[PDB]
Design a protein around this ligand. Structure first.
Ligand SMILES: O=C(O)c1ccc(Nc2ncc3c(n2)-c2ccc(Cl)cc2C(c2c(F)cccc2F)=NC3)cc1
Length: 261
């Protein structure tokens, strides 16, 4: 991992509380960055998670995964320095921009998330916490996976993972279907409505999230396939990216809307 000298880093404003201590926006040798710190007295476990997270991110090289600029490990507090994402978290972004994008733009955002997720699944990582709040958005409208999930958000979690803790790339596919629904609704809360216990009961009875307004048939059909009770009947991320690519290349296909009620 690139080791960054602290003289090349400037914290400018706290922007978050974070898993490890404060998160800042700042400037780097100048490019704006986000800066995650590990405050003093951190534990061995915390150090292994903090620098372990940075270790995987630096190795990764995909357009839809947050870019790591480097780490500060020689000096304290330790720092993880990532590209700054101008539009912030996807869930908050969509809720502040209700109705402002075209269906083609919405589907392009989902394609990027699917590609990024695919890269993670092929590299043998299970996210476990795939939700719009864990995707960031830049000034090109590109969505990149962050957080990295857990090493349990009920409303985003697949039935087999709730019921017996089987987290796989197929339960991430379930979560991705929820993310599709979050994007298509501009950040509605899944199952708005229902208690956590009622969601778990509803999912196992075959209930599913309803059709969003202005949602293409193909898009609602795909998220419904992501929500197959049986893991093996869910599409792979490769299948998902491929389908979304065909829809994006023939944009009139997105003009056929699933009925809304
Ligand atoms: O609302 C705005 O105006 C706004 C908010 C944020 C940004 N830009 C930005 N860019 C990169 C990061 C963050 N924020 C950021 C900020 C705070 C915290 Cl607590 C976490 C992160 C994270 C993060 C992460 F590590 C795991 C999971 C989710 C994350 F969001 N990643 C770097 C721009 C505008």
């Amino acid at each position: 991992t690139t080791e960054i000298h602290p003289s090349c880093v400037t914290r400018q404003k706290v922007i978050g509380a974070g898993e490890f201590g404060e998160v800042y926006k700042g400037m780097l040798k100048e490019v704006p960055v986000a800066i995650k710190t590990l405050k003093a007295g951190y534990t061995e476990k915390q150090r292994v998670d903090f620098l372990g997270e940075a270790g995987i991110m630096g190795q990764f090289s995909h357009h839809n995964i947050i870019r790591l600029e480097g780490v500060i490990s020689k000096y304290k507090p330790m720092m993880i320095i990532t590209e700054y994402m101008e539009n912030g978290a996807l869930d908050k972004f969509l809720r502040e921009k209700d109705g402002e994008f075209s269906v083609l733009q919405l589907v392009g955002m989902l394609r990027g998330i699917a590609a990024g997720m695919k890269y993670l699944a092929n590299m043998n990582y299970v996210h476990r916490d795939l939700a719009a709040r864990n995707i960031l958005v830049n000034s090109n409208l590109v969505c990149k996976v962050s957080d990295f999930g857990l090493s349990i958000p009920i409303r985003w979690t697949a039935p087999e993972a709730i019921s017996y803790r089987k987290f796989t790339s197929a339960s991430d596919v379930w979560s991705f279907g929820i993310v599709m629904w979050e994007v298509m609704t501009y950040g509605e809360r899944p199952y708005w409505e229902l208690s956590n216990h009622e969601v778990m009961k509803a999912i196992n009875d075959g209930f599913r999230l309803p059709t969003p307004m202005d949602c293409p048939s193909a898009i609602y059909q795909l998220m419904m396939q992501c929500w197959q009770q049986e893991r093996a009947r869910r599409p792979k991320f490769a299948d998902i990216v491929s389908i979304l690519d065909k829809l994006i290349r023939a944009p009139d296909s997105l003009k056929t809307l699933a009925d809304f009620d």
